[PDB]
Design a protein around this motif. Structure first.
Motif, short mmCIF file in Angstrom:
data_model
loop_
_atom_site.label_atom_id
_atom_site.label_comp_id
_atom_site.label_asym_id
_atom_site.label_seq_id
_atom_site.Cartn_x
_atom_site.Cartn_y
_atom_site.Cartn_z
N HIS A 4 -97.57 94.19 -11.60
CA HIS A 4 -96.20 94.50 -11.98
C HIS A 4 -95.68 95.77 -11.32
O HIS A 4 -96.34 96.82 -11.38
CB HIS A 4 -96.07 94.57 -13.50
CG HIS A 4 -96.18 93.23 -14.18
ND1 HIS A 4 -95.50 92.12 -13.72
CD2 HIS A 4 -96.90 92.83 -15.25
CE1 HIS A 4 -95.81 91.08 -14.49
NE2 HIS A 4 -96.66 91.49 -15.42
N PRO A 5 -94.52 95.69 -10.63
CA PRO A 5 -93.93 96.83 -9.93
C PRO A 5 -93.27 97.87 -10.85
O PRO A 5 -92.70 98.85 -10.38
CB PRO A 5 -92.91 96.16 -9.00
CG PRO A 5 -92.42 95.04 -9.83
CD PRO A 5 -93.69 94.47 -10.42
N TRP A 6 -93.42 97.67 -12.16
CA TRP A 6 -92.82 98.57 -13.13
C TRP A 6 -93.73 99.53 -13.89
O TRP A 6 -93.25 100.37 -14.65
CB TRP A 6 -91.95 97.79 -14.12
CG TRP A 6 -92.55 96.52 -14.71
CD1 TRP A 6 -92.30 95.24 -14.31
CD2 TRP A 6 -93.41 96.42 -15.86
NE1 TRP A 6 -92.92 94.34 -15.15
CE2 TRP A 6 -93.60 95.03 -16.11
CE3 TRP A 6 -94.02 97.36 -16.72
CZ2 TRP A 6 -94.40 94.56 -17.19
CZ3 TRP A 6 -94.82 96.89 -17.80
CH2 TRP A 6 -94.99 95.50 -18.01
N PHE A 7 -95.04 99.39 -13.72
CA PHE A 7 -95.97 100.28 -14.43
C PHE A 7 -96.37 101.47 -13.57
O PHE A 7 -97.08 101.33 -12.59
CB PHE A 7 -97.19 99.52 -14.92
CG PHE A 7 -97.98 100.26 -15.97
CD1 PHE A 7 -97.61 100.20 -17.32
CD2 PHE A 7 -99.11 101.04 -15.60
CE1 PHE A 7 -98.35 100.89 -18.31
CE2 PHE A 7 -99.86 101.74 -16.58
CZ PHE A 7 -99.48 101.67 -17.94
N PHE A 8 -95.94 102.65 -14.02
CA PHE A 8 -96.21 103.90 -13.30
C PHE A 8 -97.23 104.85 -13.91
O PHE A 8 -97.47 105.93 -13.38
CB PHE A 8 -94.89 104.63 -13.07
CG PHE A 8 -94.12 104.11 -11.89
CD1 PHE A 8 -93.42 102.89 -11.97
CD2 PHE A 8 -94.08 104.85 -10.70
CE1 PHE A 8 -92.67 102.40 -10.87
CE2 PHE A 8 -93.33 104.38 -9.59
CZ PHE A 8 -92.63 103.15 -9.67
N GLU A 18 -86.06 111.60 -11.49
CA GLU A 18 -85.92 111.96 -10.07
C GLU A 18 -85.91 110.73 -9.15
O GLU A 18 -85.04 110.62 -8.28
CB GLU A 18 -87.06 112.91 -9.68
CG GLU A 18 -86.97 113.59 -8.32
CD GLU A 18 -88.24 114.37 -7.98
OE1 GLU A 18 -88.54 115.38 -8.67
OE2 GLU A 18 -88.96 113.96 -7.04
N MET A 19 -86.83 109.80 -9.38
CA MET A 19 -86.90 108.59 -8.55
C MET A 19 -85.91 107.48 -8.93
O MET A 19 -85.42 106.78 -8.05
CB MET A 19 -88.34 108.07 -8.41
CG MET A 19 -88.99 107.52 -9.66
SD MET A 19 -90.58 106.74 -9.23
CE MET A 19 -90.00 105.38 -8.17
N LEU A 30 -88.73 101.45 -15.12
CA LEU A 30 -90.17 101.68 -15.08
C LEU A 30 -90.69 101.93 -16.50
O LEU A 30 -89.92 102.33 -17.38
CB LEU A 30 -90.53 102.87 -14.15
CG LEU A 30 -90.14 104.34 -14.37
CD1 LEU A 30 -91.15 105.03 -15.28
CD2 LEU A 30 -90.10 105.06 -13.04
N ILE A 31 -91.96 101.61 -16.72
CA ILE A 31 -92.62 101.88 -17.99
C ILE A 31 -93.62 102.97 -17.63
O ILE A 31 -94.29 102.89 -16.60
CB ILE A 31 -93.37 100.64 -18.59
CG1 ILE A 31 -92.38 99.57 -19.11
CG2 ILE A 31 -94.32 101.06 -19.73
CD1 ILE A 31 -91.72 99.84 -20.46
N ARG A 32 -93.66 104.01 -18.44
CA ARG A 32 -94.59 105.11 -18.20
C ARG A 32 -95.32 105.45 -19.48
O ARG A 32 -94.89 105.09 -20.58
CB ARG A 32 -93.85 106.34 -17.67
CG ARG A 32 -92.66 106.76 -18.52
CD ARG A 32 -91.86 107.87 -17.88
NE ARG A 32 -90.66 108.14 -18.67
CZ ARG A 32 -90.61 108.92 -19.75
NH1 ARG A 32 -91.70 109.55 -20.19
NH2 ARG A 32 -89.47 109.05 -20.42
N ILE A 97 -87.71 97.78 -9.66
CA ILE A 97 -87.46 98.95 -8.82
C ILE A 97 -87.59 98.53 -7.33
O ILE A 97 -88.32 97.58 -7.02
CB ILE A 97 -88.48 100.08 -9.23
CG1 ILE A 97 -87.73 101.37 -9.59
CG2 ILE A 97 -89.64 100.29 -8.22
CD1 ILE A 97 -88.61 102.44 -10.20
N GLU A 98 -86.84 99.18 -6.45
CA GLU A 98 -86.91 98.88 -5.02
C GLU A 98 -87.81 99.86 -4.27
O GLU A 98 -87.61 101.08 -4.32
CB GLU A 98 -85.51 98.87 -4.39
CG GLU A 98 -84.72 97.59 -4.66
CD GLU A 98 -83.27 97.66 -4.17
OE1 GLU A 98 -82.75 98.79 -3.97
OE2 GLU A 98 -82.64 96.60 -3.99
N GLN A 99 -88.84 99.31 -3.62
CA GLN A 99 -89.83 100.05 -2.83
C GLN A 99 -89.53 99.89 -1.33
O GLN A 99 -88.55 99.18 -1.00
CB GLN A 99 -91.24 99.52 -3.13
CG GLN A 99 -91.73 99.75 -4.56
CD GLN A 99 -92.86 98.79 -4.96
OE1 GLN A 99 -92.64 97.84 -5.71
NE2 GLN A 99 -94.06 99.06 -4.46
#
Ligand SMILES: CNC(=O)[C@H]1[C@H](C(=O)N[C@@H](CCC(N)=O)C(=O)N[C@@H](CC(N)=O)C(N)=O)[C@H]1c1ccc(OP(=O)(O)O)cc1
Length: 99
Positions: A4-8, A18-19, A30-32, A97-99
């Motif tokens: 998943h591109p959302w777990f930081f 900031e991001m 994002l999930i943090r 999120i866009e990478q």
């Protein structure tokens, strides 16, 4: 599957802001893992020129929720909110999120 591109993980709230402010679409999220409340999760979402923060609340049953509807997993919370708004005032749908 792909991860998943959302777990930081354990990133600071300020770092998340900031991001996300740099992202181009409303709903980019994002999930943090919360530092302020150890063991818990937090949802950070971009909308307009602001970055909104939501606590991923837990109950005694281990369910995950933001408002009233309860979910069995973080994955189900996220997926539901791609088609249903995280806010009652504005239409904010979660999108990768866009990478
Ligand atoms: C400065 N105060 C806030 O951010 C408050 C955030 C809020 O109420 N947000 C709105 C939603 C976003 C907005 N309107 O800007 C709300 O009504 N949240 C509800 C629902 C929810 N699940 O967060 C609540 N406070 O119970 C709280 C918060 C507090 C902590 C946190 O984890 P870390 O400390 O960011 O890891 C995430 C959100």
């Amino acid at each position: 599957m792909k991860p998943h591109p959302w777990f930081f993980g354990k990133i600071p709230r300020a770092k998340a802001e900031e991001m996300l402010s740099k992202q181009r679409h409303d709903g980019a999220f994002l999930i943090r893992e919360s530092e302020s409340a150890p063991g818990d999760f937090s949802l950070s979402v971009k909308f307009g020129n602001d970055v909104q923060h939501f606590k991923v609340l837990r109950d005694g049953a281990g369910k995950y929720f933001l408002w009233v509807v309860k979910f069995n997993s973080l994955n189900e919370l996220v997926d539901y909110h791609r088609s249903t708004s995280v806010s009652r005032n504005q239409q904010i749908f979660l999108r990768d999120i866009e990478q």
